[PDB]
């Protein structure tokens, strides 16, 4: 019935780098989704205690949210752009696992995912 700890946003043992693709993911992809009309349900981990959703973390074992992704990018947690893209896709996948067609949260996820795909399809080349 408790929330899990949020996903780690730094691993002090991992090497760190900046790349044009990671810059794109933070400054173009995440930033565009973050200011979207439908961003607010996805800006932080699902708080299953405050929202009284005790089955959420019984169903969702790989939680992910844009707040975690944003912190991961700002902390240089990701070495490969693919790692971050996987996290965005996990976030959307979780929403479709837990919810149903026609749900408000699903219509919001679909709109955000459409925008995510438009931006990720312009990911710059590997410098
Ligand atoms: C009724 O839902 C809410 C009511 C109020 C607020 S809040 O922004 O006022 N605030 C959030 C931070 C803590 C204080 C309250 C947010 C929500 N929900 C969500 O954020 C959310 N986000 C997701 C991904 C999902 C959900 C819930 C629907 C099913 C599971 C799911 O998939």
Swiss-Prot record:
Ubiquitously expressed. There is a cross-link at residue 58 (Glycyl lysine isopeptide (Lys-Gly) (interchain with G-Cter in SUMO2)). Transmembrane segments: none annotated. Residues 17-123 form the Bromo domain. The record marks 99 as: Acetylated histone binding. It is found in: Nucleus; Chromosome. Phosphorylation by CK2 disrupt the intramolecular binding between the bromo domain 2 and the NPS region and promotes binding between the NPS and the BID regions, leading to activate the protein and promote binding to acetylated histones. In absence of phosphorylation, BRD4 does not localize to p53/TP53 target gene promoters, phosphorylation promoting recruitment to p53/TP53 target promoters. It comes from the Eukaryota. The NET domain mediates interaction with a number of chromatin proteins involved in transcription regulation (NSD3, JMJD6, CHD4, GLTSCR1 and ATAD5). It is linked to Cornelia de Lange syndrome 6: A form of Cornelia de Lange syndrome, a clinically heterogeneous developmental disorder associated with malformations affecting multiple systems. It is characterized by facial dysmorphisms, abnormal hands and feet, growth delay, cognitive retardation, hirsutism, gastroesophageal dysfunction and cardiac, ophthalmologic and genitourinary anomalies. CDLS6 inheritance is autosomal dominant. A chromosomal aberration involving BRD4 is found in a rare, aggressive, and lethal carcinoma arising in midline organs of young people. Translocation t(15;19)(q14;p13) with NUTM1 which produces a BRD4-NUTM1 fusion protein. Belongs to the BET family. Interacts with p53/TP53; the interaction is direct. Interacts (via CTD region) with CDK9 and CCNT1, acting as an associated component of P-TEFb complex. Interacts with RELA (when acetylated at 'Lys-310'). Interacts (via NET domain) with NSD3, CHD4, BICRA and ATAD5. The interaction with BICRA bridges BRD4 to the GBAF complex. Interacts (via NET domain) with JMJD6 (via JmjC and N-terminal domains); the interaction is stronger in presence of ssRNA and recruits JMJD6 on distal enhancers. Interacts with NSD3. Interacts with NIPBL. (Microbial infection) Interacts with bovine papillomavirus type 1 regulatory protein E2. This interactions may serve for the tethering of viral genomes to host mitotic chromosomes allowing successful partitioning of the viral genome during cell division. JQ1, a thieno-triazolo-1,4-diazepine derivative, and I-BET, a benzodiazepine derivative, have been tested on tumors with success. Treatment with GSK1210151A (I-BET151, a I-BET derivative) has strong effets on mixed lineage leukemia and promotes myeloid differentiation and leukemia stem-cell depletion. Chromatin reader protein that recognizes and binds acetylated histones and plays a key role in transmission of epigenetic memory across cell divisions and transcription regulation. Remains associated with acetylated chromatin throughout the entire cell cycle and provides epigenetic memory for postmitotic G1 gene transcription by preserving acetylated chromatin status and maintaining high-order chromatin structure. During interphase, plays a key role in regulating the transcription of signal-inducible genes by associating with the P-TEFb complex and recruiting it to promoters. This is Bromodomain-containing protein 4. It comes from Homo sapiens. The lineage of its organism: Eukaryota, Metazoa, Chordata, Craniata, Vertebrata. The gene is BRD4. The chain holds residues 44 to 168 of 1362 of the full protein.
């Amino acid at each position: 019935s408790m929330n899990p700890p949020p996903p780690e946003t730094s691993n002090p043992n991992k090497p760190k780098r900046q790349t044009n693709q990671l810059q794109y993911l933070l400054r173009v992809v995440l930033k565009t989704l973050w200011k979207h009309q439908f961003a607010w349900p996805f800006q932080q981990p699902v708080d299953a205690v405050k929202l009284n959703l005790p089955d959420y973390y019984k169903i969702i074992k790989t939680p992910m949210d844009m707040g975690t992704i944003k912190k991961r990018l700002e902390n240089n947690y990701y070495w490969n752009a693919q790692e971050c893209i996987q996290d965005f896709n996990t976030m959307f996948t979780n929403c479709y696992i837990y919810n149903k067609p026609g749900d408000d949260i699903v219509l919001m996820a679909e709109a955000l995912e459409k925008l995510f795909l438009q931006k990720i399809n312009e990911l710059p080349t590997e410098e």
